[PDB]
Amino acid sequence: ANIKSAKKRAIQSEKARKHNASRRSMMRTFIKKVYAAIEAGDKAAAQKAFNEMQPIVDRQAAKGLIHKNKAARHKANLTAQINKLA
Amino acid sequence: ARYLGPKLKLSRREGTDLFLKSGVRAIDTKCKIEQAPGQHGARKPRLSDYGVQLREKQKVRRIYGVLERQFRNYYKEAARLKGNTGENLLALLEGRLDNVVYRMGFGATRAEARQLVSHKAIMVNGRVVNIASYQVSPNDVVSIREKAKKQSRVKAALELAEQREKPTWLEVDAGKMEGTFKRKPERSDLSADINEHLIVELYSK
Amino acid sequence: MAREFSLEKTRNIGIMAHIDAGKTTTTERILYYTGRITSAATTAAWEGHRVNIIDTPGHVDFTVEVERSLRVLDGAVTVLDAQSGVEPQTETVWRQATTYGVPRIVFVNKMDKLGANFEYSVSTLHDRLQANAAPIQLPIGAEDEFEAIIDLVEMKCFKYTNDLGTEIEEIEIPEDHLDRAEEARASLIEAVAETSDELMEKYLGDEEISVSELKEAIRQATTNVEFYPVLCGTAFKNKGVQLMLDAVIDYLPSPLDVKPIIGHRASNPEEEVIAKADDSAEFAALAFKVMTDPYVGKLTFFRVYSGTMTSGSYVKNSTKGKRERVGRLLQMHANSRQEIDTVYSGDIAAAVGLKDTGTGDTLCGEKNDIILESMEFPEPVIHLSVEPKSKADQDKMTQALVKLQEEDPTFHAHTDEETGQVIIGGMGELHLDILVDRMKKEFNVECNVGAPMVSYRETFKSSAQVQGKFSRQSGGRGQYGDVHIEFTPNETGAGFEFENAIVGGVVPREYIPSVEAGLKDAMENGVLAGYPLIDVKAKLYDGSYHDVDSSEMAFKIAASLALKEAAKKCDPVILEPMMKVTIEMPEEYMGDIMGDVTSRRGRVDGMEPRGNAQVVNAYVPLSEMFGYATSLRSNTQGRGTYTMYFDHYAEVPKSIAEDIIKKNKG
RNA sequence: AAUUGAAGAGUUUGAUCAUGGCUCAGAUUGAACGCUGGCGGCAGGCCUAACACAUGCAAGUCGAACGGUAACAGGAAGAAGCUUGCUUCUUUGCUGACGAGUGGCGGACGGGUGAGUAAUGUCUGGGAAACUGCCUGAUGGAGGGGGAUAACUACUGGAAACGGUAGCUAAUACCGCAUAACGUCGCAAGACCAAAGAGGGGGACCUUCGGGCCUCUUGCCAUCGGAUGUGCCCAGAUGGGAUUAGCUAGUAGGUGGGGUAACGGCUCACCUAGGCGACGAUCCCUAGCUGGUCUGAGAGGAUGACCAGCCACACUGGAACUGAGACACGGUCCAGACUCCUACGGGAGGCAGCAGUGGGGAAUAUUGCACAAUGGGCGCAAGCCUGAUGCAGCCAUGCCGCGUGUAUGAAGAAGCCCUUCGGGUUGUAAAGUACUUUCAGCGGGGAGGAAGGGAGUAAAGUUAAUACCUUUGCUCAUUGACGUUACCCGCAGAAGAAGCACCGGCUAACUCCGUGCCAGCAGCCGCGGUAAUACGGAGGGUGCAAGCGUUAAUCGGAAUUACUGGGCGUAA
Numbered sequence A: 001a002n003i004k005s006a007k008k009r010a011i012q013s014e015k016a017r018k019h020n021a022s023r024r025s026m027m028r029t030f031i032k033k034v035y036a037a038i039e040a041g042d043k044a045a046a047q048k049a050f051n052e053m054q055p056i057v058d059r060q061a062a063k064g065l066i067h068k069n070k071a072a073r074h075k076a077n078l079t080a081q082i083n084k085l086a
Numbered sequence B: 001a002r003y004l005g006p007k008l009k010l011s012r013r014e015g016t017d018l019f020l021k022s023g024v025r026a027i028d029t030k031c032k033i034e035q036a037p038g039q040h041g042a043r044k045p046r047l048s049d050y051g052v053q054l055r056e057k058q059k060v061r062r063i064y065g066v067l068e069r070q071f072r073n074y075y076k077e078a079a080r081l082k083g084n085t086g087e088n089l090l091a092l093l094e095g096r097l098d099n100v101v102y103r104m105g106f107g108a109t110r111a112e113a114r115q116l117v118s119h120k121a122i123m124v125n126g127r128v129v130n131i132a133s134y135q136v137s138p139n140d141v142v143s144i145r146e147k148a149k150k151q152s153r154v155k156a157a158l159e160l161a162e163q164r165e166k167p168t169w170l171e172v173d174a175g176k177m178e179g180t181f182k183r184k185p186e187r188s189d190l191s192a193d194i195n196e197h198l199i200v201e202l203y204s205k
Numbered sequence C: 001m002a003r004e005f006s007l008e009k010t011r012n013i014g015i016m017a018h019i020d021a022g023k024t025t026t027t028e029r030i031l032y033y034t035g036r037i038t039s040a041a042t043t044a045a046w047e048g049h050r051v052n053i054i055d056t057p058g059h060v061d062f063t064v065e066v067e068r069s070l071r072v073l074d075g076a077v078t079v080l081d082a083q084s085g086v087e088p089q090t091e092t093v094w095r096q097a098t099t100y101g102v103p104r105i106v107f108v109n110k111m112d113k114l115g116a117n118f119e120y121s122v123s124t125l126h127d128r129l130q131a132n133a134a135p136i137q138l139p140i141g142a143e144d145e146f147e148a149i150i151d152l153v154e155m156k157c158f159k160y161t162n163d164l165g166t167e168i169e170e171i172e173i174p175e176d177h178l179d180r181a182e183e184a185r186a187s188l189i190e191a192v193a194e195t196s197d198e199l200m201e202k203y204l205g206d207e208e209i210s211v212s213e214l215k216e217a218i219r220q221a222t223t224n225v226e227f228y229p230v231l232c233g234t235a236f237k238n239k240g241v242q243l244m245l246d247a248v249i250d251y252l253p254s255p256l257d258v259k260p261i262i263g264h265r266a267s268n269p270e271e272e273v274i275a276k277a278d279d280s281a282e283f284a285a286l287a288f289k290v291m292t293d294p295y296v297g298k299l300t301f302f303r304v305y306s307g308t309m310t311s312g313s314y315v316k317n318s319t320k321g322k323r324e325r326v327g328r329l330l331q332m333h334a335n336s337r338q339e340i341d342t343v344y345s346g347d348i349a350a351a352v353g354l355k356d357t358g359t360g361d362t363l364c365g366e367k368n369d370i371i372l373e374s375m376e377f378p379e380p381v382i383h384l385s386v387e388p389k390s391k392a393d394q395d396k397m398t399q400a401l402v403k404l405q406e407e408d409p410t411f412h413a414h415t416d417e418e419t420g421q422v423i424i425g426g427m428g429e430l431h432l433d434i435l436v437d438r439m440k441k442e443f444n445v446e447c448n449v450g451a452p453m454v455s456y457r458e459t460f461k462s463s464a465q466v467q468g469k470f471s472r473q474s475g476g477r478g479q480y481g482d483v484h485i486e487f488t489p490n491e492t493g494a495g496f497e498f499e500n501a502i503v504g505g506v507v508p509r510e511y512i513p514s515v516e517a518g519l520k521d522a523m524e525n526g527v528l529a530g531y532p533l534i535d536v537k538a539k540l541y542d543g544s545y546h547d548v549d550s551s552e553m554a555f556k557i558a559a560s561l562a563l564k565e566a567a568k569k570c571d572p573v574i575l576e577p578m579m580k581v582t583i584e585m586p587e588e589y590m591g592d593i594m595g596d597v598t599s600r601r602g603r604v605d606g607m608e609p610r611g612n613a614q615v616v617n618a619y620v621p622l623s624e625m626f627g628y629a630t631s632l633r634s635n636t637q638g639r640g641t642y643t644m645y646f647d648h649y650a651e652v653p654k655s656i657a658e659d660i661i662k663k664n665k666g
Numbered sequence D: 001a002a003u004u005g006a007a008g009a010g011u012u013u014g015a016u017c018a019u020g021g022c023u024c025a026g027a028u029u030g031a032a033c034g035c036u037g038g039c040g041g042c043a044g045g046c047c048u049a050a051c052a053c054a055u056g057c058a059a060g061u062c063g064a065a066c067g068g069u070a071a072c073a074g075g076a077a078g079a080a081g082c083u084u085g086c087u088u089c090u091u092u093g094c095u096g097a098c099g100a101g102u103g104g105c106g107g108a109c110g111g112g113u114g115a116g117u118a119a120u121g122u123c124u125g126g127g128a129a130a131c132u133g134c135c136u137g138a139u140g141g142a143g144g145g146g147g148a149u150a151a152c153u154a155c156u157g158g159a160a161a162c163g164g165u166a167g168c169u170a171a172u173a174c175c176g177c178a179u180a181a182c183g184u185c186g187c188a189a190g191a192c193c194a195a196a197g198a199g200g201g202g203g204a205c206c207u208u209c210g211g212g213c214c215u216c217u218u219g220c221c222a223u224c225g226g227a228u229g230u231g232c233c234c235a236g237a238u239g240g241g242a243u244u245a246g247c248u249a250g251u252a253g254g255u256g257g258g259g260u261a262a263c264g265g266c267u268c269a270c271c272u273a274g275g276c277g278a279c280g281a282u283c284c285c286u287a288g289c290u291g292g293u294c295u296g297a298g299a300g301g302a303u304g305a306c307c308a309g310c311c312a313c314a315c316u317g318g319a320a321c322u323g324a325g326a327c328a329c330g331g332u333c334c335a336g337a338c339u340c341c342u343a344c345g346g347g348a349g350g351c352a353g354c355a356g357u358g359g360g361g362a363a364u365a366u367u368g369c370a371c372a373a374u375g376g377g378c379g380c381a382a383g384c385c386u387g388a389u390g391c392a393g394c395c396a397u398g399c400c401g402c403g404u405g406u407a408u409g410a411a412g413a414a415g416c417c418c419u420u421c422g423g424g425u426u427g428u429a430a431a432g433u434a435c436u437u438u439c440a441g442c443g444g445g446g447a448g449g450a451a452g453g454g455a456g457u458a459a460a461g462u463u464a465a466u467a468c469c470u471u472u473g474c475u476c477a478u479u480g481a482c483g484u485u486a487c488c489c490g491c492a493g494a495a496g497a498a499g500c501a502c503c504g505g506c507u508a509a510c511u512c513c514g515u516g517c518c519a520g521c522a523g524c525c526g527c528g529g530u531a532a533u534a535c536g537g538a539g540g541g542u543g544c545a546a547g548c549g550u551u552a553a554u555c556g557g558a559a560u561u562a563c564u565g566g567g568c569g570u571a572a
């Protein structure tokens, strides 16, 4: 970079990128657990896993990592599958 | 921007006095008006329609002392203005401050009158105007500067104007050296010699 | 806002010498010394004096650079080798500076060299150069022993303790050298006394000359170019360099001291306008060098003779008669290139962004209309037939030549119409070699040089009467024409002289002009080896015509046939262009020069003792003259000059002529 | 009132009519070249190499976020450095500022360019499945903790680029927790999700002497709105070529899952065999689109510099990241081409921002001035930044205006030219005699673009306060690059200001003398071999005028692609 602000912005963006990735990976991990439980066929396990995910995705959407629509889609899709699984 | 050559030659070519001199003496004494200028000027060749139209347009330009570019713009304006293009054109040429000054009698010749305008001698509505092309509107007071009042040339010009026919659209007062542009001159007021129709034709070829 | 150094402080000097005299070494040392505590000119500060130094080449081929520098320089420093003294090129540069009347000081470098003799070097100055020179300094010892220099003017001594030019211990003149120093000082006084009558009377009065008094007289004499101060030292061993710089400040003139340049007013060439070194006066500068720097672009160096110039302004090139935007003004220093905002009188500076500006041009304000006298450069001594290796290069070759011609005045290029050959001209073999190589690389134009092709002519040796007749009735219209012409050899140089001796109108008057025209056309074509026939008279004494078949074209054909048969009987010979050669050299080399001429199929027309260099006049074939410059310099020890101009056309030696015919045939 | 609108001519023949092409008279230009050139206003100015670029500048700002305090002046203290306390030399964020750092916001704007693109473009008219920093309405919050970390410090490797290691520390930086429905999810019941504080002033009140509390100001969070911007869908329109006829396989559709802010083969699995095309698919060539510009009576034809909207692009080819917004001119990463620096151990770069250089070309300007004004970023504000923008420079490049004198002046001179050798023409033209001075030059005076922002001073609100602060009056001193401004007055003097093309016909203007199918001319027809109004030169004339010609280019005339508005027996 040639501009002082550009240099700083590059450093700050890397800092953010790492933080965001850590949070994003964790969220995805939790979502996958719900999906895996649905695949397994254990409604109880799926429901439990969903109850763990709900607060995470909602908080992530609030923080700005994801959008509320994205959080809603996750909850909606899983809920439907879990209910059918029952 | 101005013709500074022999004025008599112009009149000789057109075969008519273009009033380019004071008029103190007969133009005949000054030059052979009949003969055109030059070695072969005496010989009178046949003139084609183009030649006839050209001479007419040139004549009017020579009388009011307007170059081609400015004259063409006048024609376009005349065409734009509602009414007879030919007559409209003549009105625009009349409105010129320089022409107004000469007609009011402040200037002996339009050439001299133009010098007065350029030298800021003239004042329109109490405001100094140094543009000859300036169009004087109806109901406009055209006076002369105090210094201009002192100028002897102006006084002589007034005398010549008395000899000439008085414009019916201009109210001029001597001593005060102030004239009023009452209205735009009607085609009737303008000389019938001018064949504006030929000019309109030439500028619509 | 104001010039840092006054006009008085300014010192525009130049270094001139023979090849490997030590000019570059000297300049480098000067820059280091001035700098402590490239390009055309470098600015330096010494004892609160601006010193603009220009290093000039020693080779005869690069005489241009010496010439252009001298025009725009106030003073100069001649470097000399202690062992050899004045050398051929030292003489050349001395005469050049004498023409411009440039005050000079002599520095005998290489005092550490084996065979170094300061006294011998000083003697050569008096003998070879015939100049009023005297040592202002004396060396103590020679070669390795040389470790101390004596200031004769102040009668002091400086013991150089090292080759680093530092820790120099100023001491008293050694008693042994003191006696020598006294004698030398006496001689010094006498020389300057010749120039300064006051000093002479003071010397005659035997009153001890004041050091200041003497210095003032020396300054005057040097500035008047009447006396030449001689110094000594070794640049490589850093000895005497500092003293030389001091002498520059103390003796070499300032822009004020130098005589004013008179410039002819452009409006009235007859009107002459003197230009003084006044900043308040109208600006007037002369461009002396035009180069292109890779970073900034084209750099035009100039010398402000009068007035002041500020960057970001418009000036007018009086020579070109065009306005020039002076965007940037760069001043070159020992290390970096600093951008100056204002250039004052007596200052050398480089303008960036000037267009259509060449060397010798007078740059001035728009109001100003003065044209300062331009510099005079010599004419080519060597000519070669340059040509591109490929046709694609020919385009590039043209552009290359143009640029090269602009950069170097002495470089010339032209196309001989007859031979249809572009010929390059230069000041020597080395010069043209460098130019060619530059085209090959910089301009990327692969070219091949050679001897310029010589255009030959033909003439009839015998007189014969011949009849030419034409007849064409084979197809429809018939054409007939007959002419009896006598082709007589004409006095060389007279040219074609057609004679109409037709009597009784045997040939109709109307057809006679066509007869001549036909002959002229036929004579333009070769009658032997395809070379225009010259120096022949044709007499139309008799002929015939057929009213019906008479056509001017027929008579023209008949004329051609007549010339053909004339050739078969008139013995056509090949002629070669002969050039009058005027060679000036010292009498010592006269025998060799004459021998070379009589070896190149040349004849000595005579000789004359012009000045101190005998001038030999001779006529030599143009083809033979090729390469005379190099041989001349070889024979005359680079002390020979010549001028060649076409004189007449002479018959080629039968053997050589035979070859020419064969060549033209195929 | 917006309404003015339609011209022909030359050239095929011995002559004619027709047909038909060629040429010409007119407008217009980013123009170029030749010759010439006084001034001013306004505008325009690389169409070439999206060729390569030396150098400076074009994006910062905020201490009323935070730890600080390097740097300069203070504030006290102070050996007071000091000796008359004359001078004021140590201390400490204290304290106005403030380097670097952390943080916030901006950098996705503004500016450049038209390479690519014949349509995930543009234009016109609609649509539904979205999102939206700053700004604005309404309704509630902003509770209580923790773990870090830059700067910094020590040490240490670098030629440089810049780093490495161990401690250390703060926040409106970061993360749990509490609380939260007019939020999300769900049929419902339920479940779950947030924050940030920082400044101004001050009275009971108080220790923790910092504060706390009260109030004022600003900021933070949630939801629902507005506005604005943006994404997406559809129809029609927006070049040429068939000497391009077949094209397609995520292709066409369906179902389910995933994905997106959102719809959707967007993606994937599976199923079906579809989809498209002679109303031109596919392929090839060319090209940014539009409002508009030029021409035309119009219909059309041509065209898309400058201005404005839209799109695309940023060394070339990819790729994400950050963010409200980018797959980002002056950001990152990879690869490539190319260049540069070097201590040879390694580094660095992207003018299609403004100047400018080299090159290319017939050809296109200064490395200018100011942020005074408008507008934008940041900020509480002051202010700072702004090659945006306002101005200045160069250029007859265009448009427009103006000057270079006015009047008089006849044997009408001289001279030139012609001559019918008499005169005539040049020509009132000259000289001369009167006479006025724009503009130019010199000097003098002197608008408006300036609104605000300050210092306050008073009132009102403000609340505990009359605080603070805000608002409105009022007072006072100032705020212009242009700029030696526009403009006016005085000065003396006609001084300092005319050129270019043309004269055979077309087409306004004719002779003399050279030259003799030569040398030349030439839009077309044609001229030139003994005078040639056609060449060459001179006189005279004509047309234009600080311009005049020439070349290039578009339209017209050309009803000569005929929709308006043409033809096919013999002219196609």
Ligand SMILES: CC(=O)O[C@H]1C[C@@]2(C)[C@@H](C[C@@H](O)[C@H]3[C@@]4(C)CC[C@@H](O)[C@@H](C)[C@@H]4CC[C@@]32C)/C1=C(\CCC=C(C)C)C(=O)O
Residues within 6 Å of the ligand: C055, C056, C057, C058, C059, C061, C062, C064, C065, C407, C408, C430, C431, C434, C435, C438
């Ligand atoms: C600096 C100075 O004094 O002269 C310099 C400068 C120098 C004269 C150069 C030699 C030669 O190229 C010269 C010519 C004429 C060569 C031909 C062109 O290109 C000219 C435009 C050029 C100008 C000067 C130049 C470039 C020098 C020499 C001479 C070197 C000797 C030999 C044998 C090659 C030098 O430096 O010694």
Ligand SMILES: Nc1nc2c(ncn2[C@@H]2O[C@H](COP(=O)(O)OP(=O)(O)O)[C@@H](O)[C@H]2O)c(=O)[nH]1
Residues within 6 Å of the ligand: C017, C018, C019, C020, C021, C022, C023, C024, C025, C026, C058, C109, C110, C111, C112, C113, C233, C234, C235, C236, C237
């Ligand atoms: N012995 C000796 N050699 C010297 C001296 N000064 C210079 N030289 C050498 O002589 C040569 C001169 O070369 P240069 O300076 O280029 O001379 P130029 O051709 O006159 O410019 C170089 O080899 C120098 O090192 C000196 O004082 N003594």
Ligand SMILES: [K+]
Residues within 6 Å of the ligand: none
């Ligand atoms: K026709």
Ligand SMILES: [K+]
Residues within 6 Å of the ligand: D250, D265
């Ligand atoms: K697809």
Ligand SMILES: [K+]
Residues within 6 Å of the ligand: none
């Ligand atoms: K691209």
Ligand SMILES: [K+]
Residues within 6 Å of the ligand: D562
């Ligand atoms: K039709």
Ligand SMILES: [Mg+2]
Residues within 6 Å of the ligand: C023, C024, C025
């Ligand atoms: Mg050298």
Ligand SMILES: [Mg+2]
Residues within 6 Å of the ligand: D287
């Ligand atoms: Mg394109």
Ligand SMILES: [Mg+2]
Residues within 6 Å of the ligand: D558
């Ligand atoms: Mg048509």
Ligand SMILES: [Mg+2]
Residues within 6 Å of the ligand: D566, D567
């Ligand atoms: Mg037809």
Ligand SMILES: [Mg+2]
Residues within 6 Å of the ligand: none
């Ligand atoms: Mg037929």
